[PDB]
Design a protein around this ligand. Structure first.
Ligand SMILES: [K+]
Ligand SMILES: [K+]
Ligand SMILES: [K+]
Ligand SMILES: [K+]
Ligand SMILES: [K+]
Ligand SMILES: [K+]
Ligand SMILES: [K+]
Ligand SMILES: [K+]
Ligand SMILES: [K+]
Ligand SMILES: [K+]
Ligand SMILES: [K+]
Ligand SMILES: [K+]
Ligand SMILES: [K+]
Ligand SMILES: [K+]
Ligand SMILES: [K+]
Ligand SMILES: [K+]
Ligand SMILES: [K+]
Ligand SMILES: [K+]
Ligand SMILES: [K+]
Ligand SMILES: [K+]
Ligand SMILES: [K+]
Ligand SMILES: [K+]
Ligand SMILES: [K+]
Ligand SMILES: [K+]
Ligand SMILES: [K+]
Ligand SMILES: [K+]
Ligand SMILES: [K+]
Ligand SMILES: [K+]
Ligand SMILES: [K+]
Ligand SMILES: [K+]
Ligand SMILES: [K+]
Ligand SMILES: [K+]
Ligand SMILES: [K+]
Ligand SMILES: [K+]
Ligand SMILES: [K+]
Ligand SMILES: [K+]
Ligand SMILES: [K+]
Ligand SMILES: [Mg+2]
Ligand SMILES: [Mg+2]
Ligand SMILES: [Mg+2]
Ligand SMILES: [Mg+2]
Ligand SMILES: [Mg+2]
Ligand SMILES: [Mg+2]
Ligand SMILES: [Mg+2]
Ligand SMILES: [Mg+2]
Ligand SMILES: [Mg+2]
Ligand SMILES: [Mg+2]
Ligand SMILES: [Mg+2]
Ligand SMILES: [Mg+2]
Ligand SMILES: [Mg+2]
Ligand SMILES: [Mg+2]
Ligand SMILES: [Mg+2]
Ligand SMILES: [Mg+2]
Ligand SMILES: [Mg+2]
Ligand SMILES: [Mg+2]
Ligand SMILES: [Mg+2]
Ligand SMILES: [Mg+2]
Ligand SMILES: [Mg+2]
Ligand SMILES: [Mg+2]
Ligand SMILES: [Mg+2]
Ligand SMILES: [Mg+2]
Ligand SMILES: [Mg+2]
Ligand SMILES: [Mg+2]
Ligand SMILES: [Mg+2]
Ligand SMILES: [Mg+2]
Lengths: 383, 65, 141
RNA sequence: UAGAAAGCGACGCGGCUUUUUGAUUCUUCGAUGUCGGCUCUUCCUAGCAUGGCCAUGCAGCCGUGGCGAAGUGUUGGAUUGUUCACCCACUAACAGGGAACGUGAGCUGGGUUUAGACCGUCGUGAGACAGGUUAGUUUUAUCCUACUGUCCAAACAGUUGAAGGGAGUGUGGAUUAGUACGAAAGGAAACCCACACGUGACCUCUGGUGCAGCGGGUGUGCGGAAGUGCAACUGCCAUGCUACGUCUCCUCAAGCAUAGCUGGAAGCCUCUAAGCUAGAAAUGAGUCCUGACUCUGGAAGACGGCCGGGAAGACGACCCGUAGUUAA
RNA sequence: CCUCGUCAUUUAAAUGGUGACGCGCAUGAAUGGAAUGACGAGAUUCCCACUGUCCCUACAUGUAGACUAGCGAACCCAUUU
RNA sequence: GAGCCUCUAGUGGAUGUUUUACACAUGUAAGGGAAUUCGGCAAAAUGGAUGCGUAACUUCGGGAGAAGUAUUGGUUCAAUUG
RNA sequence: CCUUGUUGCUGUGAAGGCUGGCGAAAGCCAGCUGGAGGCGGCAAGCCGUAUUGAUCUGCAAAUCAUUGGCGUAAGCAGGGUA
């Protein structure tokens, strides 16, 4: 018989099976379309999640048809996330070829001198090594093997990508001695131009200001917070049963009909929740800056850094460059994230508007924070 | 930037925190937190709550008008 | 859209505040028309989902019945606008407000007010979408 | 209002369906738990709303009859054990059904249908009554298979993408405009902005919670005070977790119904017989989740345990550190 | 029985409750008839207070449960699923 | 000779681990207040003593603690049971 | 049927009695004394309404928790006898 009343499904089947992610560091798996009409540029980067705060911005957005004469301006309060982005270092390149089975890698070429931080990823246990890792490779520079290698890459390739690592030693709160390694794609120009651009930059440091600027739209890829094994009420959102029932209320009561004589994959069951890969599209950059240069607005004539009183709770003080973005972002503090240029441009009016800040909150995140600087606390109390 | 000054405690309130309570007498009043709103309801006199800026001024621990 | 008895001809934009008032709620009448207490029986604009009771915030139009008031007026169905609420609300500028007691005010099908004077304070945002209320309120916040 | 056929369609005639109730007794009486509701998933179309179109007794507004289409929706209550019925309120709309009359080792136990008892009618009586009334025990998974997650098959670092899943839906306001159209009364048609329901995340703010921490009192113990047990009560409140909080959600290609272009059959004609153009919330891809077989690289040592932690956790597994901005 | 009888009151809305009416399928006088008080873990309807019953669920405590040492069964079974 | 706390006299073992989900005994909750369900089932609310004030009906005994309201700790005094 | 055991704390305040007032009489009204009842709230006990709670390979071939009914009496009980 048909059910008595209509209702929507619980949870989305776009994310089933909901299994645990394999490792905590994401690869950018998809990149925006190349265009030979533009200069050679990079398309992505790595970042670390610091924490959250709030800001006040001015706005003037209204319906184009609204008949009001006056150029109304209005304050809006918004929550923001802070990400730390030290410069990445380039250490090699890869070329790929198109086939009936997709892209396949032809060869990889590495710089003559490599850092202790990057060699540390290649071994499993840090404190137990003979360190004979890349010691024979430098001969290939003398032999001309490098010059033969570049020829083959230049002759037979469709897509070129660089290899870059992050300078973990600059962020002590991570307790980490192995760098993270990411493969990043180059768009613009021809294969030859791409290869020459790469060759000029092996061993050097690229700042985040190469890749992104204020007001840009970007996509953020990360792994969510973990929550362990959980029941259907939390995993899929199903309703709790009648209060006087025996054998438990926090369950789906009926898990199928008599035929077919099996359970369907569409029914909710208990299991893992959290620690999955998720991508957030079209987030907007409100600000870019540095952890130890003070700043001011046109209206707030105090001069202060981004760091709140006492630092972010399990991190401390930002020291390197940073990005600020609208809304919340995947995962807890200290997790690695991958940043990408937006896959396609947005038509929505909320996305394409300007941003003008007047205040940024710098009060303590432990307890009720009631001062913006140590000077105010010293003035409120005696002496 | 401040939201204002708390009615009961005397404490200045940061932008984006605290709440206004509006009575049927037609008055609007600003409180720092739920703590001090509740003390008003229970008719605890502020001068007896010794950490308040009000109490400290009344005792003459802090220079005031 | 205008259907059934007591239809409404004067639709306005909702604000997205929290919804403290729902079917079953008894609340005071703030105007001088002669009703005293209203019992909430429906809300305009609600399409509904399974097991959920219809709810309203400031600015919304409710269907109610008169449970206290003058003899001519009792046990009849009427339309009213919600002017204040005991549940907390958040403005887009980040300010939060809370009133001591909730209340509503009676209107005609065309959106005209029934009475001539309104007791006590009224929320600013309501006076932006219902302009006639501005004229006869006690104070605006 | 003329007029068979906009819409209807007497008197007769041919079919389809199994969702009603019959008809029959093939399977089960060394037992297949029997009505309704609650909870949750999937399917059908004979299409109620939402999208594209054709006819009209289509001026406009509101409608009525038909075509391709099953993606997304179809609610809150009063009396009643009800399925059913009938009213009130909202709504874009409140269509109709199937899955052992879906679903009792998932619940509930109001109805029916053991043993107590009352009433009416029938019986000389014991007793009867698809007549009415009240009280009346809901057992067991630790096996196999399915389903949901977890490890291994697969050294370490960087990747590839076969195949499987799939997601956004609708309402209102403003403007066009008191305009076209109509004797008048009335009265339409993008882009932008606000919201609801659904989906995925997040704690800066605001609610909630009080395990760590600080305070207060009642009865009675340790000679007094101070420090405190037991019975338990009570005000505030870090970190964390959470919603009553905050952020989130479009673009191509091939083409349905239809309306057209060129054009014969058939010197004329004609959307079709070849060929071409515009075309839907539908279909197939991309952006989104899972990740088969592969591919590129470094080096005579590599890797696991043991020891200590967490941002991770049922156990494994994952992320990390071990003579250092290491721990206490 | 017909039957969710008709009219009034209680609700926004009454197959319910109370008040009336009566050719009553098939009421009725110790097979006892009718109207009250005091008293029922008896059956039924409404109002005030009160609330996680519900909207719509969230957080926390003790004891089991998961993993580990010592001890150690039963129902059931043509079985290749 | 209630419950709670102490004196005399008497008393105790299947080991380690901070330990997900679902349970079983319990706490607390914004705004709303029976909308839940056959049905307020379960829970919450009321609670001792002192005073003021107490209706219909009744077999005149009762109803009656009707209902409805106010007070209550420590200290230092008067006055002698108020 | 014969012989025995087992009533603690509290509320209400019948019959009878003493004073004072009112009345021509008969007998009416106050305050106090007295302590009746298959009479009220509880304790020890005896019982078995609800949660259709726990348990259902049980602690147990009828048990446990909270919640209930009576408790100055057609109440509960040992032994001997029919
Ligand atoms: K069903
Ligand atoms: K992809
Ligand atoms: K509190
Ligand atoms: K049988
Ligand atoms: K049954
Ligand atoms: K249609
Ligand atoms: K459908
Ligand atoms: K059962
Ligand atoms: K599996
Ligand atoms: K090897
Ligand atoms: K696919
Ligand atoms: K929070
Ligand atoms: K908190
Ligand atoms: K003790
Ligand atoms: K708090
Ligand atoms: K085309
Ligand atoms: K597909
Ligand atoms: K080798
Ligand atoms: K370890
Ligand atoms: K009726
Ligand atoms: K009635
Ligand atoms: K008779
Ligand atoms: K008779
Ligand atoms: K007789
Ligand atoms: K009884
Ligand atoms: K616990
Ligand atoms: K254990
Ligand atoms: K004693
Ligand atoms: K005692
Ligand atoms: K009810
Ligand atoms: K009912
Ligand atoms: K029950
Ligand atoms: K009399
Ligand atoms: K009474
Ligand atoms: K007595
Ligand atoms: K039971
Ligand atoms: K035992
Ligand atoms: Mg949990
Ligand atoms: Mg049960
Ligand atoms: Mg904090
Ligand atoms: Mg429901
Ligand atoms: Mg059938
Ligand atoms: Mg069986
Ligand atoms: Mg059999
Ligand atoms: Mg069976
Ligand atoms: Mg069809
Ligand atoms: Mg069935
Ligand atoms: Mg079954
Ligand atoms: Mg029953
Ligand atoms: Mg029987
Ligand atoms: Mg019984
Ligand atoms: Mg504590
Ligand atoms: Mg240190
Ligand atoms: Mg009923
Ligand atoms: Mg009657
Ligand atoms: Mg008789
Ligand atoms: Mg509450
Ligand atoms: Mg409250
Ligand atoms: Mg219901
Ligand atoms: Mg009860
Ligand atoms: Mg005695
Ligand atoms: Mg007695
Ligand atoms: Mg006892
Ligand atoms: Mg007995
Ligand atoms: Mg029973």
């Amino acid at each position: 018989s048909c059910r008595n009343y209509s209702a929507p499904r619980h949870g989305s089947l776009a994310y089933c099976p909901k299994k645990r992610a394999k490792t905590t560091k994401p690869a950018i798996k998809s990149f925006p379309k190349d265009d030979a009409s533009k200069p050679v540029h990079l398309t992505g980067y790595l970042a670390y999640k610091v924490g959250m705060t709030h800001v006040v911005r001015l706005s003037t957005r209204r319906s184009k048809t609204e008949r009001v004469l006056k150029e109304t301006q209005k304050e809006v309060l918004d929550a923001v996330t802070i990400l730390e982005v030290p410069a990445m270092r380039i250490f090699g390149m890869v070329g790929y070829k198109s086939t009936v089975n997709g892209l396949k890698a032809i060869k990889t070429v590495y710089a003559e001198h490599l850092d202790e931080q990057v060699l540390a990823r290649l071994r499993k246990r840090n404190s137990r090594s003979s360190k004979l890792m890349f010691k024979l490779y430098p001969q290939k520079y003398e032999n001309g093997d490098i010059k033969r290698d570049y020829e083959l890459l230049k002759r037979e390739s469709d897509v070129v990508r660089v290899l870059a690592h992050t300078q973990v030693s600059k962020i002590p709160s991570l307790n980490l001695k192995k760098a993270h390694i990411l493969e990043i794609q180059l768009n613009g120009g021809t294969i030859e131009e791409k290869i020459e651009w790469a060759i000029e930059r092996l061993e050097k440091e690229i700042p985040v200001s190469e890749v992104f600027s204020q007001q840009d739209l970007i996509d953020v890829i990360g792994v969510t917070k973990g929550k362990g094994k959980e029941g259907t009420t939390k995993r899929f959102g199903t309703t709790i049963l009648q209060h006087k029932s025996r054998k438990g209320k926090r369950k789906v009561a009926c898990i199928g009909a008599w035929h077919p004589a099996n359970v369907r994959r569409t029914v909710a069951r208990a299991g893992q929740l959290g620690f999955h890969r998720r991508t957030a599209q079209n987030k907007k950059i409100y600000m870019m800056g540095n952890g130890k240069t003070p700043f001011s607005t046109e209206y707030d004539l105090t001069s202060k850094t981004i760091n709140p009183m006492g630092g972010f709770l399990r991190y401390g003080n930002v020291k390197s460059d940073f990005i600020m973005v609208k809304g919340g972002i995947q995962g807890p503090s200290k997790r690695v994230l991958a940043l990408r240029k937006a896959f396609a441009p947005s038509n929505l009016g909320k996305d394409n508007e300007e941003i003008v800040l007047k205040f940024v909150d710098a009060s303590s995140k432990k307890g009720y924070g009631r001062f913006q600087t140590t000077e105010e606390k010293k003035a409120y109390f005696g002496i | 930037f401040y939201e204002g000054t708390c009615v009961y405690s005397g404490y200045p309130v940061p932008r984006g925190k605290g709440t206004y309570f509006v009575s049927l007498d037609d008055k609007s009043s600003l409180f720092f937190s739920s703590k001090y709103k509740n003390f008003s309801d229970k008719k605890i006199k502020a001068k007896r709550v010794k950490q308040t800026l009000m109490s400290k001024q009344f005792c003459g621990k802090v220079e005031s008008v | 859209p205008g259907k059934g008895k007591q239809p409404l001809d004067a639709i306005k934009n909702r604000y997205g505040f929290t919804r403290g008032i729902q079917v079953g709620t008894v609340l005071a009448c703030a105007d001088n028309s002669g009703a005293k207490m209203l019992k909430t029986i429906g809300v305009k604009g609600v399409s509904g989902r399974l097991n959920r009771l219809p709810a309203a915030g400031p600015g919304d139009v409710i269907v109610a019945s008169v449970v206290k008031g003058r003899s001519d007026m009792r046990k009849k169905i009427v339309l009213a606008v919600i002017i204040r609420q005991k549940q907390m609300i958040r403005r887009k500028d980040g300010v939060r407000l809370q009133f001591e007691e909730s209340a509503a005010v009676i209107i005609s099908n065309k959106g005209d007010l029934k009475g001539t004077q309104i007791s006590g304070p009224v929320l600013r945002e309501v006076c932006d979408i219902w302009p006639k209320i501005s004229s006869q309120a006690g104070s605006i916040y």
